[PDB]
Design a protein around this ligand. Structure first.
Ligand SMILES: CCOC(=O)N1Cc2ccncc2C1
Ligand SMILES: CCOC(=O)N1Cc2ccncc2C1
Lengths: 254, 300
């Protein structure tokens, strides 16, 4: 059924599964016309399709040409997402096809179920989790490949870099969602925490900096404080007054 | 001018004939129903006074044979039977009429209600939905499941309504996923009308039969089928003008006939709100929208 806090270890079992997030597929800037009307201008988007066990990210770049002369674009975007996920599944060898696809937005359920009628044994599920995958476009190297694209393109990444050499997929997913939540809440502050010590760089073949295990512990702590700091700024709350139990809950609850 | 005699009425029962009903007492001298209009299919139905769970009946056409009712004390129900001896049957009916032991089908001369409910319903089509080839009449009851319900147990006792499923390969052409899901015209016009039903008259007959089984028996799978056949039309951008005009008439008489006190169990809020206010055909069902707004404004 619905993926939640209860059935969370299920993300890291040996049943192949993918998360699909459609929140960066259809992207626009809203602007004034010469006559003082409002118009949109689309920019390049992406489907964020992620294996949470392996870190394999299928970034399908959505070029603005897709939208040319189409109507009801927010509706079409869900169906185009479903079309491309079903094309990806059909492209994979049988032993690599997912057993489950989890959509981050319940509006993707019917479009994806309809495109996957040929795969009755692939379960299409919603989730109760509020996942921060909208912030994928805060990862500089992902933003760069999307905005430079001149045509439809699929790019493959490992969103965990080499982390699984040192940590479990449970802890890698934790680190990923904490980093994306911080980038979503305060992008400027998040980037300044990641990128401020010049001695620590991003490998050419990586998305994130090359932190030692001890430095990751410090980074993770600075990200958790950023999310608390911003929660205090947003709700006018004295953070310094909160307990570790209070702090604990806001650091998932969101 | 046709007659369905009863051997006797050994148990207290409410008897329906089409939209009419009356109470018969345990061992009351009741010997049946006379003056049944030729030209239409009819339904005789029963609800036992000592057990309202016993709810069942028979579809029949008096043009296809001589039918009577006889209580079976083993199976504990009123059974329809065919009498093949014409002269015996004629003699039975004659005696019961002379002794005035029969109720008269109470048709008001102005009243086209039954024709309006059964316009497209034909006994040969009922016999394909309800399969029991040794009888010319068809047994239905409140608990009988549909082939579709049995997919999501005993197949011999099933209502074989045409399966409608909006998220099925039958409903959705590969490559036209969004198109076919948001506009059901393909599924209505090519698959159902041209393909399975052959014409709108057969589609409406099944729709009307499903309504009648839902209303007269409280058959849940019948109510599901009635709503699915309405939703398939209302969700189609391209429907012939004659089919929309006829559907408006069909639904008007169905909503007219529904007992006010069963509206809560027989009408699906989502489907009616969608059909009348959001669908392609939201503006095409003037008579149905007016009677629904005036009779059931709560539901909406
Ligand atoms: C690796 C350590 O993990 C965490 O500290 N998290 C996961 C996580 C994910 C999303 N928001 C907050 C948090 C706190
Ligand atoms: C051919 C598939 O089924 C039909 O065509 N019917 C069912 C049916 C049941 C009662 N009256 C008319 C009809 C038309």
């Amino acid at each position: 059924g619905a993926m939640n806090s209860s059935n969370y270890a299920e993300l890291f079992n040996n049943d192949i599964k993918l998360f699909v997030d459609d929140t960066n597929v259809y992207r626009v800037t809203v602007h004034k016309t010469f006559e003082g009307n409002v118009a949109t201008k689309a920019i390049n988007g992406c489907i964020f399709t992620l294996n949470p066990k392996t870190g394999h990210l299928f970034l399908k770049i959505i070029h603005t040409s897709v939208w040319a002369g189409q109507k009801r674009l927010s509706q079409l975007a869900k169906w185009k997402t479903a079309e491309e996920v079903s094309a990806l599944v059909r492209s994979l060898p049988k032993e690599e096809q997912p057993k489950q696809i989890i959509v981050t937005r319940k509006a993707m359920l019917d479009p994806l179920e309809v495109h996957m009628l040929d795969f009755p044994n692939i379960a299409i599920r919603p989730t109760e989790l509020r996942l921060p995958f909208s912030a994928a476009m805060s990862i500089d190297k992902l933003s760069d490949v999307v905005m430079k694209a001149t045509e439809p393109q699929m790019v493959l990444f490992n969103i965990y870099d080499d982390w699984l050499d040192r940590i479990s997929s449970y802890t890698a997913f934790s680190r990923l969602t904490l980093l994306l939540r911080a980038l979503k809440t305060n992008e400027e502050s998040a980037k300044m925490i990641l990128l401020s010590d010049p001695t620590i760089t991003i490998k050419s073949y990586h998305l994130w900096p090359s932190f030692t295990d001890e430095q990751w512990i410090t980074i993770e702590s600075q990200m958790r404080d950023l999310i608390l700091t911003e929660y205090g700024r947003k709700y006018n709350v004295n953070i310094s007054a909160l307990t570790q139990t209070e702090i604990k809950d806001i650091i998932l609850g969101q | 001018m046709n007659t369905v005699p009863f051997t006797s009425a050994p148990i207290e029962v409410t008897i329906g004939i089409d939209q009419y009903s009356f109470n018969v007492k345990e061992n009351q001298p009741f010997h049946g129903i006379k003056d049944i209009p030729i030209g239409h299919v009819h339904v005789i139905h029963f609800q036992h006074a000592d057990n309202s769970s016993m709810r069942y009946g028979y579809w029949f056409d008096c043009r296809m044979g001589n039918f009577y009712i006889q209580y079976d004390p083993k199976d504990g129900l009123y059974k329809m039977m065919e009498e093949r001896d014409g002269a015996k049957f004629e003699n039975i009916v004659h005696n019961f009429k002379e002794r005035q032991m029969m109720v008269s089908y109470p048709k008001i001369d102005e009243d086209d209600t039954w024709y309006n409910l059964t316009e497209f319903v034909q006994m040969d089509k009922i016999r394909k939905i309800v399969r029991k080839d040794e009888n010319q009449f068809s047994y239905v009851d409140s608990s009988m499941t549909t082939v579709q319900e049995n997919e999501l147990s005993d197949p011999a006792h099933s209502l074989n309504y045409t399966v409608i499923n909006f998220k099925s390969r039958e409903a959705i052409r590969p490559g036209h996923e969004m198109e076919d899901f948001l506009d059901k015209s393909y599924y209505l016009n090519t698959v159902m009308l041209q393909g399975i039903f052959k014409n709108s008259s057969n589609y409406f007959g099944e729709l009307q039969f499903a309504f009648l089984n839902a209303m007269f028996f409280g058959n849940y799978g019948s109510s599901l089928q009635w709503h699915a056949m309405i939703e398939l039309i209302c969700s189609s951008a391209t429907v012939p003008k004659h089919m929309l005009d006829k559907l408006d008439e069909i639904l008007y008489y169905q909503i007219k006939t529904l007992p006010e006190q069963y509206s809560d169990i027989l009408l699906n809020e989502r489907v009616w709100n969608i059909c009348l206010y959001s669908s392609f055909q939201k503006n095409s069902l003037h008579n149905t929208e007016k009677i629904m707004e005036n009779k059931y404004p709560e539901l909406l």
